[PDB]
C-alpha cells in the first residue's frame, strides 16, 4: 500500500 | 496536479530532482512487480526532452548494471533542466543513448519504456514521433508508459492522432482524467498510481476522484437489527407503457435488490400485471389510460400515490409522445419528493421545471438523452465532465451520465465510475440503475451518495457474472447485485 | 482429395509409396494413442485389393514383431501396384496372409483393422464382403477403419447396403463428407485426421470444411470497452400468433444472449405480453390483428418498426395461412434491411421475392421446410449439400439447413456444423437459433459469418447441459449460450 | 547397421526413399514430444550432401506450413540421390535454402536441426564445417541432431576435431557405439531410438547392446520361498592388507547386499577384525602373515577355505608386491572354482595362468589396471571394446572394463553399461562391485550374466542417492543396492 | 498437433 | 513404445 | 531483487 495504489 | 508538483517544490521545498528521482525508481519497481525479476530483460527507453523524458532517464540509469541491456533513444530537440540533469547522469553512469530511431531496434529489446510525452503533450503527434509510436504499437513488445501513454491528452483521455498502447502505466500522485475517460483509459493498460512524495494534504485536495471500493463501503447505509420495511424506505416507480411492459420490473427490482423496504410500481393496465407475474414481491398498481400511455388524466392518481413514499423514480419505458410530455412536466413540477428521472422522462423534460422544483432530483441520461436534453451533438456531450458539471450546478441536481466510465456530479464534487463491462451495453441495464439509485435515496443517502454507490455496485454486479459478459442480461444483473454488496463488505 | 493425392504425386513429386507408407504408420500411431501399448493385442487386418488395402498392408507389416499376433485376410481379386508392393513387403518381413474368411477367426483376435474399401467404394457391398462386414459388426471386437469405414460412400455419408461400424477412423489429409454427414458420421467412431505429407497449400484449397472452434473464435465480434447498446446493434423479431405465443421469447432471447444491444419483438396482442412476463429485458410490441395472425393490415406498422433496426428476423410461430402469406411476401419484398427468415415465414415464402430483394437474407429451414420450399421430398433434400449450394447461389442468400450436421452455405463457401446433440431435437431449439443469427448480423458479422458462429455456439450450448440431453429444453439452452461463448475463448 | 539399411533395401525391398521419409518424420515427432507444440518455433536446418542431409530435407519439408519459419542452410558440394530427391521436394513444397552461412542467422531462429554428417563422417571436420559447428555450439539455441551429432565418429564415440553438442539426438534402428561411449555420449543429449521400418529380425541380429532394465529384470535369480542360505550360495573373498583394511568389508557387503547366502572374508590379522566391527553379519577369517600381506605361506589355508564355497573373489586391497604376486598366481592356478579377480590381484597376475585354468574367471579392471595388464597405454585401452573382446576370447574369461560406460564382454557377446554417475568416481566403488559379481555367480548366474546384472545395479544404486552425487561414498552405495533391486522389479 | 487433428 | 525407445 | 538484497 505505501508506494502503490491500483 | 501541475499545481501540485509546483506547490510541493515552490511551497513545501522538495527539490524537483528529488521528485523526478522518486518518479523514475517507482516506474522501475512497478515493472519489477509486474514482470518479475528484471535482469532477464533488455530495455529500450524512449525519451523526449521534457520532464517526462527526464523521468525516463532516471528509469534508464537505474536499470544500468542490473538488466541484460539498456538503450535510450532520445527524441527531443532541447532538454528541460531536470531532463538535462538526468541525461547527464545516465551518461556518467555509462549509459548508451542514440538520437536516430531505426525501425529494427525493436528486435534487440524486450521492453519499451515509453517516456516521450506526458502531461505536457500539446496538440497532435505527427512526424517522427507518429512513426515511432506506430512502430512500437506494431511490435508486440511489452510497453510501459511513464505517467501517461504518449499521445493521450491527460485532461480528456483523447488520442491526439496517435498514442501508445501500454501494458502498464505508472502515474504519479493521482490518476489523471486521461487514465479514466476513454480512449485513454483503454490505452493505459494496468495503471499504478505511485506515491512520489507529495504531501498527503495536496493529494487529497483534488476536486475529482474515481469511485473506490472503500468509498462505497463507507457510504452503504447501516442495517440496524431492530428495523422493519419502513426503516428502509418506500419507493414509487412511475413507468411503463403498452410498448414497454418490462422496464418497470427491472427498475422495481433494482430498488428491492439494494435493500429498500417497499417498491410500488405504477404502470398502465394491463401491463402492470407483468411485473408481479415474474416477481410477485413487487406491488404493481394498475393505472387506467386511454391509449396505453400516461397522460394528464393520471396526474392526480400519481400525486396521491406519491404522498406516502420517500422517493419517486419516473421514466423507464414511459414512451416519448405529447401525452407523456404534459404528464411528466406537470408531475415533476408539483412533486415535493426527491425524484430520479430517467429514460423517456428525460426525453420530454422541460428543464425550467428542475429549476422551479424545491425538492431534489437525480437525472440519469446516457449520452443520447444528454445530447437531446441540452440540444447538442452526441460527440459534444460524451465524456464531457465540464458540461455535466455546469448542468448539475445550474439546475440544482445530480447528473449521472452513463458510459463505460460514468460521470456522477452535483456541480461541485465530480466522481468517475470505472466498474462494469460490456454486458451492461444492452437494453435494460439502465432501467435497473434507476431503481438502485431511488432505492438508496429511500434508505436515506443523499442523491450524490446514492448515485455514487449505485453506479459502483451496478458495474460490479456486471463483473461478477460467471459466463461471458456479452451474454449478460438485466435479469441476471438483478441477481448479481446482492453479491456485489456482500463482496463489497 | 483424389485430386490431391494425384497432384502431390504428379506435380509435387511425392512417390505414391511414400504417401502409402505415411498412411499406414499413421494408423498404427493413432491406434497406439487410443489403445495404449499395442504389444498386448492380436490384430486381424482385413485387406481389399485397392490402395485402401495397401494401406492395410503397411499397417500389418509395421505391427509384425511388436504385437502378440498379426493376421491378414486378403479379400481382393487383383492388387493395385501400391497394394501389390505392400503385400510383397508384408510377406518378405514374415507376415501371414489368408484369402478365406472363417467366421470363427474373430475369436483369436482382439482388434480388427478394416482396410477393405475406402474412397474407391463404388455402389453396393454384397456377397462375401457383406457377410464379412456383418460378422465384424456382430463380434464386439475393437474396430479401426482405414480412411473411411468400408461401405460408407465417402461423398455422401451413405451406407451402401452395409458398412463397418468403427470405434476409430483414421483419415488422410482432410475429413471426407462421409465422415461428416450421417449415417457415415455415426459409423466412423472417433475420427483422426492424419497428416501424411500433402502440401499445406493443397490441404487448404478445399472448398468445404467443418466449422471449428478456432474458426468461430476468430469470427466472434470484438467487444470494445467504450461501447453502448448501439454498438452491438438492434434486432426486430416479427413473430408469434394466437397459436404460438412462446416462439418469439425464444428468438428474442437468443438475440440477447449472443450480445445484441436491443431486441424488439413484434407479436399479436395479447400474446406479446407473454415475452416480458418471463424476460422483462425484452421489449415486446403489441400488434393489433383481426384473428390473432399477422396480415396485410400490419404491413406498414412493421415497416415503421423496421426503419430503426439493423436486421429483422421473421417467422417463428407466425402460423401458416393466407393472411400470413400475403403479409410475409409483401414485407420481405419491401424490407431494405438484412432478413433472417425461418419457420412459417419459410412455409408461405414466394422465392421470386428473394431474387427481387436488394438486401441480404439468411433462410434457416429444417428438411421439412426445405422439402416444402423447393417442392421435393424430405429424403431428397436431407444432407443434400449440392441442392443447398444451388439454392443459395440462385437466390443470392445463405442457406442454413438444420440437421444433426447442419449445412451452412452461400453458394461458394460451404460449412458443416457438427456440434450438438439430441436435446436440440425438440421444439424451440430452432427458434433460439434464428435469434442468435439475427443477433450476430446486428453486431456486424456477415450473414455467412453470423450463421457459422451461431450454429456452432448453439450446438455447443446443448453439449454443455449438465444432465441428460433428452431433458434439455430451449429455456435451458438459452442459459447455456453465454457459457458456450466463454468456453470458446 | 549400414549392413542393415542395405539389407532392408536390397533383400527386403524397402525403397530407400521410404526409409529416409520415415527417418525425417520421426525426428519431427521426437522434437514435438520434447518441445511441445512446434508451431511457435523458427527452425534452422543444417544439411550436408549425404543421406544425413537428406534426412534433414525431410524434416525441413515436413515443418513447412506448420511452424513459424523454416530455413535450410545447405553445406554439401554434391548430393546423394536420396538427398537430391529430398532437396527437390523441399523446394517444390516452397521451402527456402541458402548455401552461405552467415554467423548472425542464428539470431532469427530458435531450433537448430543438425543434419550435416551422420554415420558417413570420415576423418576430421575442418574449415567451413568447423566454424559452423562451433557457431551453433556458442549460440545457446536448442540443438537437435539427426542420427548422430555431426562430428562424433559413430563407431568409437570420438570427437573428430569438433562436434555438435546436442540437446536431443534421434537415431534410427539401434543406438550406435558413438552414442554409448564418451565423449560422444556426452554430446548426444537426450537420445531417442526411432523405429523407421527395419525388420525386427535384423534389428535384433546386433552383436552388441546396451544393458537394459528389462534385460537385468529377466536375469535376476529367482528367490524360491522354500530356501535357506545354501540355496543362495557361498562366497569367499581373499582380500585386504595392513595398508587396506576397508576394501574387504566393501566387497563382502556387496556380496551380501545382492542376496548371497554366506560371505567369508579372508584377511590378515588383525585387519580382519575391522570387518565385523562395522558389519558383524560378515564372517572375517584371520590369516596369519609375516608382514601384513598374503604370501605363499598362506596358500594352503586359502585353498582349504575355498573347498567349501561356490566362487572366490580375490584382489581388493591385497597390495602390489612380490609376496602377493607369488601367492595370487599359485592360488588362481590351483583354484578349481570360479574366480572374480580385481584390483591388486590383477596388478600382479600372470595371464598364462588364466589360459591354464579349467575353471572360469571374471576380471574387473579399470583402465589403469587394463593398461598395465596388457602392457599398453591408458589412452589405448580406454573404451577399446575390440581390445576387451580380443582379451576375453583369448584368455577364456569375462572382461569388465570399468568406466562411466562399462564394457562387459566374453569375446562373443559384448554389453555396454550406461547406469551410474560421478559418485562412483571415488575409491571403494570398485571394491563393492567385485562382491556383487561374486555374489551373483554364487546364486547361479553365469559370469557374463552376473557381471551384466552387477554393473547395472551398481550404477543404478549410485543414481538413487538422494543428495549430491559427489558426496556419495561406498558405504551409502551399499545401502542403496537393495533399493536398486526393488526398483528394478 | 503435427501428425493428428481431432 | 512403437515409434520410440529411450 | 532490484531494491533489496538479503
Ligand atoms: N425492456 C424494456 O422495457 C426496455 C425499455 N427501454 C426503454 O426504451 C425507451 C427509449 O430508450 P432508448 O435509451 O433505447 O432510446 P432514447 O432514450 O430514445 O435514445 C435514443 C437514441 O440515443 C442513442 N443512444 C441509445 N443508447 C445510447 C448510449 N448508451 N450512448 C450513446 N447514445 C445512445 C441511440 O442511437 P442508435 O442506437 O439509434 O444508434 C438512439 O437512437 C426508454 O423509455 C427506456 O426506459 C430501454 O431501457 C431498453 C429496455
Ligand atoms: N414454443 C413455440 O412457440 C414453438 C413453435 N414453433 C413453431 O411451429 C411452427 C411450425 O413448425 P414445425 O417446424 O413444427 O412444422 P413445419 O414448419 O410446418 O414443418 C412440418 C413438417 O416437417 C416435418 N419435420 C418437422 N421437423 C423436422 C425436422 N427437424 N427434420 C425433418 N423433418 C421435419 C414434420 O414431420 P412430422 O413431425 O409431422 O413427422 C412436420 O409434419 C413454426 O412457426 C415454429 O416456429 C416451433 O418452433 C416449436 C415450438
Ligand atoms: N578403502 C580401501 O581399502 C580401498 C582400497 N583400494 C585398493 O587400492 C589398491 C590400488 O588400487 P588403485 O585402483 O587406486 O590403483 P591401481 O590398481 O594400482 O591403479 C593405479 C593407477 O591407475 C590410474 N587409475 C586409477 N583409477 C583409474 C580409473 N578409474 N581409470 C583410469 N585410470 C585409473 C591411476 O592414475 P592416478 O590417479 O595415479 O592419476 C593410478 O595411478 C587396490 O588393492 C584396491 O582394491 C581401492 O579400491 C580404493 C579404496
Ligand atoms: N511530472 C512529470 O513530468 C511530466 C511533465 O513534463 P513537461 O516537461 O511538463 O512536459 P512533457 O515532458 O509532458 O512534454 C513536453 C515535451 O514534449 C514536447 N511536445 C509537446 N507537444 C508536442 C508535440 N505535439 N509534438 C512533438 N513534441 C511535443 C515539448 O516540446 P516543446 O514545448 O518545446 O514544443 C516538450 O519537449 C509529467 O507527465 C510527469 O512525467
Ligand atoms: N488413398 C488411400 O487409398 C484409398 C483409395 O483406394 P482405391 O485403390 O482408389 O480404391 P479403394 O481401395 O478405396 O477400393 C477399390 C477396391 O475395391 C473394389 N470395389 C469397389 N467397389 C466394390 C464393391 N462394390 N464390391 C466389391 N469390391 C469393390 C475395387 O475393385 P474393382 O474396381 O476392380 O471392382 C478395388 O479393388 C483411400 O481410401 C485411401 O485409403
Ligand atoms: N541412414 C541415414 O543417412 C546417414 C548416412 O549418410 P551417408 O550419406 O552414408 O553419409 P553422411 O551423410 O553420414 O556423410 C557423408 C557426407 O559428408 C561428407 N563428409 C564426410 N566426411 C567429411 C569431412 N570430414 N569433412 C567434410 N565433409 C565430409 C561426404 O562427402 P564425400 O564423401 O563426398 O567427401 C558426404 O557428403 C545416417 O547417419 C543416417 O542419417
Ligand atoms: N462498455 C460498457 N462498459 C461498462 N458499462 C457500460 C458499457 N456500456 C454501457 N454501460 C453501462 O450500462 C448502463 C446503460 O444504461 P442505458 O440507459 O444505456 O441502457 P438501457 O438501454 O436503458 O438499459 C449504464 O450505467 C452504463 O454505464
Ligand atoms: N440429433 C440432433 N443432434 C444435434 N442437433 C440437432 C439434432 N436434431 C435437431 N438438431 C438441431 O436443433 C435445431 C432444430 O431446429 P428445428 O427448426 O428443427 O426445431 P424447432 O422445432 O423450430 O425448435 C437445429 O439447429 C438442428 O441442427
Ligand atoms: N563418471 C562415472 N560415471 C559412472 N560410473 C563411474 C564413473 N567413474 C567411475 N565409475 C564406476 O565406479 C566403479 C569404479 O571402480 P574402480 O576400480 O575405478 O574404483 P575403486 O577405486 O576400486 O573403488 C566402476 O564400476 C565404474 O564404472
Ligand atoms: K509517456
Ligand atoms: K476401410
Ligand atoms: K547430424
Ligand atoms: Mg434507457
Ligand atoms: Mg421451427
Ligand atoms: Mg580398485
Q: How are beta strands C398-401 and C168-172 bridged, if at all? A: unpaired
CA distance C284 to C307: 17
Ligand 4 atom with the smallest distance to the CA of B160 is 24
Pocket perturbation via mutation, ligand 3, pick of D237, D265, D317 by most ligand atoms within 8 A of CB: D317
CA distance C298 to C305: 11
Whether residue F1 lies within 8 A of chain D, CB to CB, comes out as no
Q: Which of D212, D154, D206, D207 is nearest to D183 (CA)?
A: D154
Q: Which of B169, B150, B171, B170 is nearest to B161 (CA)?
A: B150
Query: How many CB atoms within 10 Å of residue D305?
Result: 18
The residues, ordered by sequence, that sit 6+ positions from C409 with a Cβ below 8 Å of its Cβ are: C385, C388, C389, C392, C398, C399, C415
The residues, ordered by sequence, that sit 6+ positions from B473 with a Cβ below 8 Å of its Cβ are: B423, B426, B428, C253, C256, C257, C279, C281
The set of cell numbers assigned to D306 is: 575355498
CA distance C351 to C328: 11
Q: Which of C186, D271, D209, C252 is nearest to B426 (CA)?
A: C252
Is the CB of C420 inside a 6 Å radius of any atom of ligand 8? yes
Query: How many CB atoms within 10 Å of residue D408?
Result: 31
Give me the helix-helix angle, B51-63 and B16-35, nearest 10°: 60
CA distance D49 to C187: 48
User: What are the residues facing B213 on neighbouring strands?
Assistant: none
Query: How many CB atoms within 10 Å of residue D355?
Result: 11
Query: Contact, C374 vs C381, CB < 8 A?
Result: yes
Burial zone of C11 (CB within 10 Å; 0-12 exposed, 13-18 middle, 19+ buried): exposed
Q: Which of B71, B76, B62 is nearest to B150 (CA)?
A: B76
Residues with CB under 6 A from ligand 5: C 5, 48-53, 55, 76, 80, 117-125, 129, 146-148, 172
How many Å is the Cα radius of gyration of chain B?
A: 26
How many Å is the Cα radius of gyration of chain G?
A: 4
Query: Contact, D273 vs D284, CB < 8 A?
Result: yes
CA distance C227 to C443: 12
Query: Contact, C37 vs C31, CB < 8 A?
Result: no
Residue count (chain F): 6
Ligand 1 atom with the smallest distance to the CA of B319 is 43
Residue D217 to residues D222, D406, D484, Cα–Cα distance (Å): 11, 19, 11
Cα angle B37-B39-B41, degrees, rounded to a multiple of 5: 100
Ligand 1 atom with the smallest distance to the CA of B316 is 45
The residue whose CA is least distant from atom 39 of ligand 5 is C52
Q: How far is the CA of D306 from the centre of ligand 3 (A)?
A: 27
Query: Contact, D226 vs D243, CB < 8 A?
Result: no
Residue given cell 410530455 in the structure block = B325
Whether residue B66 lies within 8 A of chain G, CB to CB, comes out as yes
Q: Which of C403, C368, C401 is nearest to C387 (CA)?
A: C401
Q: How far is the CA of D401 from the centre of ligand 9 (A)?
A: 10
Residue given cell 590351483 in the structure block = D334
CA distance C420 to C436: 15
Q: How are beta strands C414-417 and C406-409 bridged, if at all? A: antiparallel
Query: What is the SS3 assignment for D164-187?
Result: CCCCEEEEECCCCHHHHCCCHHHH
Whether residue B65 lies within 8 A of chain G, CB to CB, comes out as no
Q: Which of D366, D306, D309 is nearest to D331 (CA)?
A: D306
Q: Which domains, from first to last, does chain D contain?
A: 1-206 (3.40.50.10260), 207-489 (3.40.1190.20)
Ligand 7 atom with the smallest distance to the CA of C227 is 1
The set of cell numbers assigned to C391 is: 439454392
How many Å is the Cα radius of gyration of chain E?
A: 4
- The separation between CA B411 and the C-alpha centre of its own chain, rounded to angstroms, equals 16
DSSP SS3 for D379: helix
Sign of the torsion angle spanned by Cα atoms C369, C374, C375, C376: negative
The residues, ordered by sequence, that sit 6+ positions from D333 with a Cβ below 8 Å of its Cβ are: D353, D356, D357
For chains B and G, count residue pairs whose Cβ atoms are closer than 8 Å.
11
Query: Contact, B293 vs B264, CB < 8 A?
Result: no
Q: How far is the CA of C86 from the centre of ligand 5 (A)?
A: 15
Q: How far is the CA of B345 from the centre of ligand 1 (A)?
A: 12
Residue given cell 438444420 in the structure block = C402
- Virtual CA dihedral for C156, C159, C160, C164, nearest 10 degrees? 120
Q: Which of C390, C356, C362 is nearest to C446 (CA)?
A: C362
Interior/surface letters C287-325, b for 16+ CB within 10 angstroms, e for the rest: bebeebbbbeebbeebbebbeebbbbbbbbbbbbbebbb
Residue given cell 442495517 in the structure block = B223
Residue given cell 566393501 in the structure block = D250
The set of cell numbers assigned to B57 is: 532517464
Closest-approaching ligand to the CA atom of C81: 5
Query: Contact, D477 vs D454, CB < 8 A?
Result: no
State yes or no: cis peptide before C344, omega within 30 of 0: no
CB contact under 8 A, A5 and B26: no
DSSP SS3 for D67: coil
The set of cell numbers assigned to C394 is: 440462385
Sheet with strand B42-47: strands edge to edge: A4-5, B190-194, B168-172, B142-146, B111-115, B42-47, B69-74, B97-98
Contacts of E3 in chain D (CB under 8 A): 29
DSSP SS3 for D424: helix
DSSP label at D104? G
Residue C27 to residues C187, D193, D368, Cα–Cα distance (Å): 17, 20, 53
Whether residue F1 lies within 8 A of chain C, CB to CB, comes out as yes
E/B touch flag: 3 or more CB pairs below 8 Å:
no
Q: How are beta strands C234-238 and C311-314 bridged, if at all? A: parallel
Q: Which of D146, D179, D149 is nearest to D164 (CA)?
A: D149
DSSP label at D114? E
CA distance B435 to B427: 15
CA distance C413 to C394: 14
CA distance C349 to D235: 101
Is the CB of D428 inside a 6 Å radius of any atom of ligand 3? yes
* Phi, psi (rounded to 5 degrees) for B481: -55, -50
Q: To one decimal place, what's the resolution in Å?
A: 2.6
Chain C stretch 250-279, residues whose beta carbon is closer than 8 A to a beta carbon of chain B = 253, 256-263, 270, 273, 276-279
The residues, ordered by sequence, that sit 6+ positions from B18 with a Cβ below 8 Å of its Cβ are: B197
Interior/surface letters B52-72, b for 16+ CB within 10 angstroms, e for the rest: bbbbbbbbbbbbbeebeebbb
Residue given cell 418497470 in the structure block = B248
User: What are the residues facing B168 on neighbouring strands?
Assistant: B144, B190
The set of cell numbers assigned to B73 is: 533513444
- The separation between CA D101 and the C-alpha centre of its own chain, rounded to angstroms, equals 37
CA distance D213 to D220: 11
Q: Which residues of D participate in the annotated binding site for K(+)?
A: 52, 114, 150
Q: How far is the CA of B149 from the centre of ligand 10 (A)?
A: 5
Q: Which of B151, B61, B72 is nearest to B113 (CA)?
A: B72
* Phi, psi (rounded to 5 degrees) for C339: -120, 140
Chain C stretch 6-35, residues whose beta carbon is closer than 8 A to a beta carbon of chain F = 28-29, 32
Ligand 1 atom with the smallest distance to the CA of C282 is 1
Is the CB of C246 inside a 6 Å radius of any atom of ligand 8? no
Query: Contact, D471 vs D275, CB < 8 A?
Result: no
B120 among the known binding-site residues?
Answer: no
**SS percent in chain E: helix, strand, coil, step 5:** 0, 35, 65
The set of cell numbers assigned to D477 is: 552405495
- Please provide the DSSP assignment of D208-277 as one string: EEEPPHHHHHHHSPP--SS--GGGG-EEEEE---SS-SSHHHHHHHHHHHTT-SEEEEEEETTTHHHHHH
Residue count (chain E): 6
Q: How far is the CA of C188 from the centre of ligand 14 (A)?
A: 29
Question: Could you list which residues have their CB under 5 Å from ion ligand 10?
Answer: B 114, 118, 145-146, 150
C284 among the known binding-site residues?
Answer: no
Residue B334 to residues B215, B238, B313, Cα–Cα distance (Å): 34, 15, 14
CA distance D262 to D260: 6
Sheet with strand D406-409: strands edge to edge: D208-210, D414-417, D406-409, D398-401, D361-364, D339-342, D311-314, D234-238, D262-268, D283-287
The residues, ordered by sequence, that sit 6+ positions from B225 with a Cβ below 8 Å of its Cβ are: none
Query: Contact, B148 vs B180, CB < 8 A?
Result: no
Q: Nearest chain E Cα to D28, which residue? A: E2
Pocket perturbation via mutation, ligand 3, pick of D328, D343, D365 by most ligand atoms within 8 A of CB: D343
CA distance D193 to D27: 10
Structure determination technique employed: X-ray
Identify which of C225, C259, C284 has the shortest CB distance to residue B470.
C259
CB contact under 8 A, C33 and E6: no
How many Å is the Cα radius of gyration of chain C?
A: 26
Sheet with strand D168-172: strands edge to edge: D97-98, D69-74, D42-47, D111-115, D142-146, D168-172, D190-194, F4-5
Query: What is the SS3 assignment for chain B?
Result: CHHHHHHHHHCCCCCHHHHHHHHHHHHHHHHHHHHCCHHHCEEEEEECCCHHHHHHHHHHHHHCCCCCEEEEEECCCCCCHHHHHHHHHHHHCCCCEECCCCHHHHHHCCEEEEECCCCCCCCCCCCHHHHHHHHHHCCCCEEEEECCCCCECCCCCCECCCCCCCCEEEEECCCCHHHHCCCHHHHHCEEEEECCCCCHHHHHCCCEEECCHHHHHHHCCCCCCCCCHHHHCEEEEECCCCCCCCHHHHHHHHHHHCCCCEEEEEEECCCHHHHHHHCCCCEEEEECCCCCCCCHHHHHHHHHHHCCCCEEEECCCCCCCHHHHHHHHHHHHHCCCCEEEEHHHHHCCCCHHHHCCCCCEEEECCHHHHHHHHCCCHHHHCCCHHHHHHHHHHHCCEEEECCCCEEEECCCCEEEECCCCHHHCCCCHHHHHHHHHHHHHHCCCCHHHHHHHHHHHHHHHHHCCCCCHHHCCHHHHHHHHHHHHHHHC
Residues with CB under 6 A from ligand 2: C 244, 246-247, 316-318, 343-344, 347, 366-369, 378, 427-428, 430-431
The set of cell numbers assigned to B87 is: 541525461
The residue whose CA is least distant from atom 25 of ligand 7 is B402
CA distance E6 to F5: 26
CB contact under 8 A, B29 and G3: yes
Query: How many CB atoms within 10 Å of residue C222?
Result: 9
Residue C95 to residues C64, C68, C82, Cα–Cα distance (Å): 7, 13, 17
Residue given cell 541458402 in the structure block = D98
CA atoms within 13 A on the CB side of D390: 6
Pairs from D201-206 (Cβ < 8 Å, separation ≥ 24): D201/C65, D201/C94, D202/D4, D202/D7, D202/D8, D203/D4, D203/D173, D203/D174, D206/D1, D206/D174
Whether residue F6 lies within 8 A of chain D, CB to CB, comes out as yes
Sheet with strand B398-401: strands edge to edge: B208-210, B414-417, B406-409, B398-401, B361-364, B339-342, B311-314, B234-238, B262-268, B283-287
Residue B302 to residues B298, B354, B442, D89, Cα–Cα distance (Å): 6, 19, 18, 86
Query: How many CB atoms within 10 Å of residue D416?
Result: 23
Contacts of E3 in chain C (CB under 8 A): 26, 29, 194-195
Whether residue F5 lies within 8 A of chain C, CB to CB, comes out as no
The set of cell numbers assigned to B293 is: 400511455
Q: Which of D444, D4, D8, D463 is nearest to D233 (CA)?
A: D444
For chain C, what is the largest distance between any 2 Cα atoms, rounded to a whole number of angstroms? 85
Query: Contact, C260 vs C442, CB < 8 A?
Result: yes
Whether residue G3 lies within 8 A of chain B, CB to CB, comes out as yes
Query: Contact, C178 vs C148, CB < 8 A?
Result: yes
Amino acid at each position: 500500500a505505501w508506494l502503490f495504489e491500483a | 496536479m501541475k499545481e501540485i508538483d509546483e506547490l510541493t517544490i515552490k511551497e513545501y521545498g522538495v527539490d524537483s530532482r528529488i521528485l523526478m528521482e522518486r518518479a523514475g525508481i517507482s516506474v522501475v519497481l512497478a515493472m519489477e512487480e509486474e514482470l518479475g525479476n528484471l535482469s532477464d530483460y533488455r530495455f529500450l527507453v524512449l525519451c523526449g526532452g521534457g520532464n517526462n523524458g527526464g523521468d525516463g532517464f532516471v528509469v534508464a540509469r537505474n536499470l544500468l548494471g542490473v538488466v541484460k541491456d539498456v538503450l535510450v533513444v532520445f527524441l527531443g530537440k532541447k532538454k528541460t533542466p531536470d531532463c538535462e540533469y538526468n541525461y547527464g547522469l545516465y551518461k556518467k553512469f555509462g549509459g548508451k543513448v542514440v538520437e536516430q530511431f531505426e525501425p529494427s531496434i525493436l528486435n534487440e529489446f524486450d521492453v519499451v519504456v515509453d517516456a516521450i510525452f506526458g502531461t505536457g503533450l500539446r496538440g497532435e503527434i505527427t512526424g517522427e514521433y507518429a512513426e515511432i509510436i506506430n512502430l512500437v504499437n506494431k511490435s508486440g513488445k511489452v510497453v510501459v508508459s511513464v505517467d501517461v501513454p504518449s499521445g493521450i491528452d491527460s485532461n480528456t483521455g483523447k488520442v491526439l492522432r496517435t498514442a501508445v498502447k501500454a501494458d502498464l502505466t505508472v502515474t504519479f500522485g493521482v490518476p489523471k482524467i486521461g487514465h479514466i475517460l476513454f480512449p485513454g483509459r483503454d490505452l493505459t493498460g494496468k495503471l499504478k498510481v505511485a506515491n512520489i512524495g507529495h504531501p498527503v494534504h495536496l493529494i487529497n485536495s483534488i476536486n475529482r476522484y474515481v469511485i473506490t471500493r472503500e468509498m462505497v463501503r463507507s457510504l452503504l447505509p447501516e442495517r440496524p437489527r431492530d428495523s422493519h420495511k419502513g426503516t428502509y424506505g418506500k419507493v414509487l416507480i412511475i413507468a411503463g407503457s403498452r410498448l414497454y411492459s418490462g422496464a418497470p420490473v427491472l427498475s422495481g427490482m433494482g430498488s428491492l435488490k439494494v435493500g429498500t423496504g417497499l417498491v410500488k410500481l405504477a404502470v398502465p393496465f394491463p401491463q402492470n400485471l407483468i411485473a408481479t407475474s415474474r416477481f410477485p414481491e413487487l406491488i404493481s398498481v394498475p393505472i387506467d389510460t386511454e391509449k396505453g400511455f400516461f397522460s394528464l388524466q393520471n396526474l392526480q392518481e400519481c400525486l396521491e400515490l406519491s404522498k406516502d413514499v420517500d422517493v419517486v423514480a419516473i421514466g423507464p419505458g414511459l414512451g416519448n409522445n405529447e401525452h407523456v410530455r404534459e404528464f411528466v412536466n406537470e408531475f415533476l413540477k408539483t412533486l415535493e419528493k426527491p425524484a430520479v428521472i430517467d429514460a423517456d422522462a428525460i426525453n420530454v423534460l422541460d428543464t425550467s421545471v428542475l429549476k422551479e422544483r424545491k425538492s431534489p432530483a437525480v437525472l440519469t441520461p446516457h449520452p443520447g438523452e444528454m445530447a437531446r436534453l441540452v440540444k447538442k451533438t452526441v460527440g459534444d456531450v460524451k465524456y464531457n465532465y465540464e458540461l455535466a458539471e455546469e448542468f448539475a450546478k445550474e439546475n440544482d441536481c445530480v447528473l449521472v451520465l452513463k458510459s463505460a466510465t460514468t460521470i456522477v456530479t452535483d456541480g461541485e464534487k465530480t466522481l468517475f465510475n470505472i466498474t462494469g463491462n460490456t454486458g451492461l451495453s444492452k437494453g435494460g441495464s439502465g432501467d435497473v440503475l434507476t431503481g438502485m439509485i431511488a432505492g438508496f435515496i429511500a434508505q436515506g443517502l443523499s442523491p450524490l451518495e446514492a448515485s455514487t454507490v449505485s453506479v459502483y455496485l451496478h458495474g460490479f454486479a456486471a463483473e461478477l457474472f460467471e459466463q461471458d459478459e456479452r451474454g449478460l442480461t438485466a435479469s441476471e444483473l438483478l441477481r448479481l447485485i446482492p453479491e456485489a454488496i456482500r463482496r463489497l463488505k
